[PDB]
């Protein structure tokens, strides 16, 4: 895994805890200060940045696992949505989702729509409208050689 991102995710997660509620206005206020979308352009665009954004999306969705608190769930969801929506590079790297992980998001979306959080459900509606998921049996690929 990219070591530099394991710290950036935890650093930006502090501002996620700083949010008072889950309403998407907090993210619009955050964007003005923590412009996480800086490296999205960088000085060079190649497989380097491709693998960079791939691993970033992967390890960020990794923080969407059940044990994380609801606020962290909303934070990770919105972060991944913004990241995917800001991918101006040639390829459109879609987030990789495991089949097992397709159970938590179900009750998550149910609780979000039942709470009348229109923005919370509209964000996922737009994500689905973009077809931004890589349906895979496992979240990552691994080999036994090492």
């Amino acid at each position: 895994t990219p070591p530099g991102l394991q710290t950036d995710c935890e650093a930006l997660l502090s501002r996620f805890q700083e949010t008072d509620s889950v309403r998407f206005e907090d993210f619009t206020e955050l964007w003005r200060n923590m412009k996480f979308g800086t490296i999205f352009c960088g000085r060079m665009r190649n497989l380097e940045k491709n693998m960079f954004t791939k691993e970033a999306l992967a390890l960020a969705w990794r923080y969407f696992l059940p044990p994380y608190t609801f606020q962290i769930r909303v934070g990770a969801l919105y972060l991944l949505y913004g990241l995917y929506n800001t991918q101006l590079c040639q390829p459109k790297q879609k987030i990789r989702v495991a089949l097992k992980d397709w159970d938590e998001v179900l009750k998550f979306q149910q609780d979000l729509v039942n709470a009348q959080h229109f923005d919370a459900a509209y964000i996922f509606r737009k994500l689905r409208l973009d077809r931004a998921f890589h349906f895979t049996a496992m979240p990552k690929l691994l080999s036994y050689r090492m």
Binding site: T38, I39, L47, R125, R131, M138, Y144
Partner: protein, 374 residues
Amino acid sequence: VSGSGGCNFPEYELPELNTRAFHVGAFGELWRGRLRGAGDLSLREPAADSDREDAAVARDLDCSLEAAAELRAVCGLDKLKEVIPENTDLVTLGVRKRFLEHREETITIDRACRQETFVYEMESHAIGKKPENSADMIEEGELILSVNILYPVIFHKHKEHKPYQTMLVLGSQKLTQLRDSIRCVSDLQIGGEFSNTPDQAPEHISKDLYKSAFFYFEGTFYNDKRYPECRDLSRTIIEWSESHDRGYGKFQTARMEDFTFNDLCIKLGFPYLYCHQGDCEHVIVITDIRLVHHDDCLDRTLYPLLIKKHWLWTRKCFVCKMYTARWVTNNDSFAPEDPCFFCDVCFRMLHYDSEGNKLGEFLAYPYVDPGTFN
């Protein structure tokens, strides 16, 4: 016998290392029933446009008819800041600065990514590839399967088997397609000897002399009988397995011209084994399986893709060191070592006079360099 034991909800056997076997064919229906998945056309449009969003959302999910949710759009699109990663307290900024520092240390230009350009081009081959005709377009929800192989041994001897290729194939295609698409330089090798007459043209490569090729997937040996010359290599594997009580249950045999990838009840990540041309072996790994997307190639016949052709070092001529070799000598009269390599111009002058008379006693064979397919 029907599909062997397997659940289409893959549960790990060893966490994150392997998964239980499952009927991959059901994935094409399971995930497409759990989600409609419609929209595999890239029909994204290039006012009335917002009226469609209203007439959709106001009845699907949102109850309010007011277009207040467009805050998301105006924030994401309009408020997007040709930028340098500086003037902010982020750790990704730090790692990007470290990467840029290491680049400015030695790296002079960005054109050192040919190894990455390989995968880049092999993936671009899958985007923007329109079909030949309407009757050739892939159907919605088509299952796609990826696969890796490890043929050679030329790589590090004192190291693991990392450097080789990965492939990609469609589920609806027949297994004969995957069989004939797999490329291995072993099939280009030629039998016999050539020292008697180097001008002899290759009469028949091993691709035709030995067409037998079979797969091994959970005790299911799929043979091929398209041509009358091939043979049943599975006759020895069943005999040697049933001769002694080795614990390996009975294996079921079948043909390849009537079996599809859907009925492959196999594990992902497990190092399966595929063999062809007698004993040539290839450790295979099914890494990932997913349905068709609106960004994949639309040509179904053109999709035994070799998505990652791993680099290979072609053997240079041992004499001149400026050309690729084609002949390996044996029992040479002057070669410092028996496995010497020679090219056309060097092989002739080595042991052949002006009119082509064989000089001295030696053996030689046509060395088809693996670079032929690379």
